[PDB]
Protein backbone atom coordinates (compact mmCIF):
# COMPACT_ATOMS: atom_id res chain seq x y z
CA UNK A 1 0.00 0.00 0.00
CA UNK A 2 1.23 3.32 -1.23
CA UNK A 3 -1.61 5.77 0.22
CA UNK A 4 -1.53 9.04 1.16
CA UNK A 5 -0.60 9.29 5.27
CA UNK A 6 1.57 8.27 8.13
CA UNK A 7 3.02 5.44 8.60
CA UNK A 8 5.31 3.90 11.70
CA UNK A 9 8.75 2.01 10.84
CA UNK A 10 9.16 -1.26 12.53
CA UNK A 11 11.38 -4.03 12.43
CA UNK A 12 11.89 -7.29 13.67
CA UNK A 13 15.51 -7.64 14.64
CA UNK A 14 15.05 -6.99 18.25
CA UNK A 15 12.81 -8.43 20.53
CA UNK A 16 9.34 -8.91 19.55
CA UNK A 17 7.69 -5.61 17.41
CA UNK A 18 9.75 -2.48 17.43
CA UNK A 19 8.95 1.50 16.37
CA UNK A 20 12.40 2.42 14.70
CA UNK A 21 10.39 5.52 13.63
CA UNK A 22 7.63 6.83 11.50
CA UNK A 23 6.89 8.40 8.19
CA UNK A 24 4.93 10.22 5.53
CA UNK A 25 3.78 8.56 2.03
CA UNK A 26 3.28 11.18 -0.20
CA UNK A 27 2.28 11.63 -4.05
CA UNK A 28 3.67 7.78 -3.82
CA UNK A 29 7.13 9.32 -2.21
CA UNK A 30 8.03 7.76 1.20
CA UNK A 31 9.43 10.01 3.43
CA UNK A 32 11.42 9.54 6.87
CA UNK A 33 14.47 10.65 8.44
CA UNK A 34 17.90 8.47 7.67
CA UNK A 35 18.77 7.25 11.22
CA UNK A 36 15.34 5.97 11.27
CA UNK A 37 16.00 3.78 8.62
CA UNK A 38 20.11 3.81 7.62
CA UNK A 39 18.86 4.22 4.29
CA UNK A 40 17.86 -0.12 4.35
CA UNK A 41 14.96 -0.72 1.84
CA UNK A 42 11.53 -1.36 3.18
CA UNK A 43 8.50 -3.51 2.65
CA UNK A 44 4.55 -2.80 2.23
CA UNK A 45 3.10 -5.78 2.71
CA UNK A 46 3.99 -8.11 -0.16
CA UNK A 47 5.89 -4.76 -1.75
CA UNK A 48 9.02 -3.25 -1.96
CA UNK A 49 10.76 0.26 -1.23
CA UNK A 50 13.68 1.01 -2.51
CA UNK A 51 15.35 4.35 -1.36
CA UNK A 52 16.02 6.96 -4.23
CA UNK A 53 17.30 10.20 -2.30
CA UNK A 54 18.63 10.65 0.93
CA UNK A 55 21.48 12.79 2.83
CA UNK A 56 22.85 11.89 6.15
CA UNK A 57 23.37 15.57 7.54
CA UNK A 58 20.35 16.47 6.70
CA UNK A 59 19.07 13.22 7.92
CA UNK A 60 16.33 12.90 5.50
CA UNK A 61 16.09 10.04 2.97
CA UNK A 62 13.09 9.39 0.49
CA UNK A 63 12.11 6.34 -0.77
CA UNK A 64 10.85 4.84 -4.53
CA UNK A 65 11.49 8.73 -5.56
CA UNK A 66 12.40 12.68 -4.65
CA UNK A 67 11.66 14.49 -2.09
CA UNK A 68 7.86 15.62 -2.70
CA UNK A 69 7.04 18.02 0.88
CA UNK A 70 7.48 21.66 -0.02
CA UNK A 71 5.73 23.52 2.42
CA UNK A 72 7.87 25.40 4.90
CA UNK A 73 6.85 26.99 8.27
CA UNK A 74 5.59 30.77 7.13
CA UNK A 75 7.19 31.50 10.89
CA UNK A 76 4.43 32.75 12.26
CA UNK A 77 1.70 30.78 12.73
CA UNK A 78 1.38 27.59 15.16
CA UNK A 79 1.53 23.78 14.21
CA UNK A 80 0.99 20.30 15.08
CA UNK A 81 3.32 17.65 15.24
CA UNK A 82 1.86 14.46 14.30
CA UNK A 83 3.06 12.43 16.79
CA UNK A 84 2.72 8.48 16.32
CA UNK A 85 4.54 7.53 19.73
CA UNK A 86 5.81 3.06 19.71
CA UNK A 87 2.67 1.36 20.73
CA UNK A 88 0.31 4.26 21.14
CA UNK A 89 -1.70 6.19 18.66
CA UNK A 90 -1.29 9.14 16.38
CA UNK A 91 -2.31 12.31 18.10
CA UNK A 92 -2.22 15.89 17.02
CA UNK A 93 -0.03 18.36 19.35
CA UNK A 94 -0.56 21.98 18.98
CA UNK A 95 2.34 23.96 19.86
CA UNK A 96 4.43 27.82 18.99
CA UNK A 97 7.54 26.50 17.30
CA UNK A 98 10.79 27.91 18.18
CA UNK A 99 13.90 28.83 16.55
CA UNK A 100 17.40 26.73 16.03
CA UNK A 101 19.99 29.62 15.29
CA UNK A 102 22.74 28.45 12.85
CA UNK A 103 25.62 30.03 11.05
CA UNK A 104 23.44 28.96 8.24
CA UNK A 105 20.15 30.32 8.86
CA UNK A 106 17.34 29.85 11.19
CA UNK A 107 15.18 26.84 11.70
CA UNK A 108 11.72 26.53 13.54
CA UNK A 109 12.25 24.06 16.23
CA UNK A 110 9.22 22.28 18.17
CA UNK A 111 10.00 21.59 22.15
CA UNK A 112 7.81 18.23 22.53
CA UNK A 113 9.47 15.55 23.89
CA UNK A 114 8.37 11.80 22.66
CA UNK A 115 10.16 8.31 22.68
CA UNK A 116 12.80 8.11 20.30
CA UNK A 117 10.62 6.17 18.03
CA UNK A 118 8.49 8.57 16.89
CA UNK A 119 11.47 9.81 14.93
CA UNK A 120 10.23 10.81 11.64
CA UNK A 121 6.75 12.08 12.34
CA UNK A 122 5.70 15.36 10.36
CA UNK A 123 4.74 18.90 11.67
CA UNK A 124 1.89 20.49 9.74
CA UNK A 125 0.84 23.71 9.27
CA UNK A 126 -2.86 25.08 9.39
CA UNK A 127 -3.52 24.22 5.80
CA UNK A 128 -2.60 20.61 6.06
CA UNK A 129 1.12 20.89 4.62
CA UNK A 130 3.81 18.52 5.59
CA UNK A 131 6.18 21.57 6.79
CA UNK A 132 9.01 19.35 8.09
CA UNK A 133 10.15 15.84 9.86
CA UNK A 134 10.17 15.89 13.73
CA UNK A 135 13.53 13.67 15.27
CA UNK A 136 16.67 15.76 15.17
CA UNK A 137 17.42 17.83 17.76
CA UNK A 138 19.19 18.35 20.62
CA UNK A 139 18.33 18.70 24.31
CA UNK A 140 18.85 21.38 26.65
CA UNK A 141 19.61 22.23 29.83
CA UNK A 142 16.83 20.86 31.90
CA UNK A 143 16.99 17.47 29.26
CA UNK A 144 13.68 18.22 27.59
CA UNK A 145 13.95 17.58 24.27
CA UNK A 146 14.00 20.37 21.24
CA UNK A 147 13.90 18.78 17.57
CA UNK A 148 14.30 20.76 14.76
CA UNK A 149 11.51 21.10 11.99
CA UNK A 150 13.72 19.62 9.26
CA UNK A 151 12.04 19.44 5.65
CA UNK A 152 13.84 18.69 2.48
CA UNK A 153 13.81 20.23 -0.77
CA UNK A 154 10.96 19.55 -4.16
CA UNK A 155 13.08 19.53 -7.28
CA UNK B 1 14.10 -6.07 7.68
CA UNK B 2 11.90 -3.46 8.20
CA UNK B 3 8.13 -2.62 7.02
CA UNK B 4 5.58 0.10 7.17
CA UNK B 5 2.02 0.07 8.30
CA UNK B 6 -0.66 3.04 8.13
CA UNK B 7 -1.17 4.95 11.58
CA UNK B 8 -3.99 7.67 9.98
CA UNK B 9 -4.40 10.38 7.50
CA UNK B 10 -2.32 13.99 7.19
CA UNK B 11 -4.95 16.25 8.31
CA UNK B 12 -4.58 19.03 11.04
CA UNK B 13 -7.43 19.00 14.17
CA UNK B 14 -8.85 21.52 15.51
CA UNK B 15 -9.52 20.33 19.10
CA UNK B 16 -6.00 19.71 19.45
CA UNK B 17 -4.14 19.36 22.38
CA UNK B 18 -1.56 22.97 22.89
CA UNK B 19 1.63 22.23 24.48
CA UNK B 20 5.09 23.29 24.37
CA UNK B 21 7.05 26.08 25.08
CA UNK B 22 8.98 28.27 21.92
CA UNK B 23 12.73 28.09 23.05
CA UNK B 24 15.27 29.30 20.54
CA UNK B 25 18.36 27.99 20.70
CA UNK B 26 21.91 28.41 19.10
CA UNK B 27 23.04 25.38 17.58
CA UNK B 28 25.78 23.42 15.41
CA UNK B 29 24.88 20.64 12.63
CA UNK B 30 27.91 18.64 12.07
CA UNK B 31 28.40 16.52 8.96
CA UNK B 32 26.94 13.64 10.55
CA UNK B 33 23.62 15.34 10.90
CA UNK B 34 23.72 15.88 15.01
CA UNK B 35 23.18 19.34 16.59
CA UNK B 36 25.04 20.60 19.20
CA UNK B 37 24.30 23.73 21.33
CA UNK B 38 26.24 26.67 21.39
Same mark, same amino acid.
Given at each position: ??????????????????? $?????????????????????????? &????????? /???????????????? @? @??????????? @? $???? &??? #??????????????????? $?????? @????????? /? #??????????????? #??????????????? | ???????????????????????? %???? %???????? %??
Amino acid at each position: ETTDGVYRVMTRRLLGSTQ $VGVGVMQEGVFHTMWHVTKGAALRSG &EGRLDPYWG /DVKQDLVSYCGPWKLD @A @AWDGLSEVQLL @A $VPPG &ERA #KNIQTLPGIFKTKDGDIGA $VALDYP @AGTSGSPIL /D #KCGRVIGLYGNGVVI #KNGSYVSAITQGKRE | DMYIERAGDITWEKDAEVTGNSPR %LDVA %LDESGDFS %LV
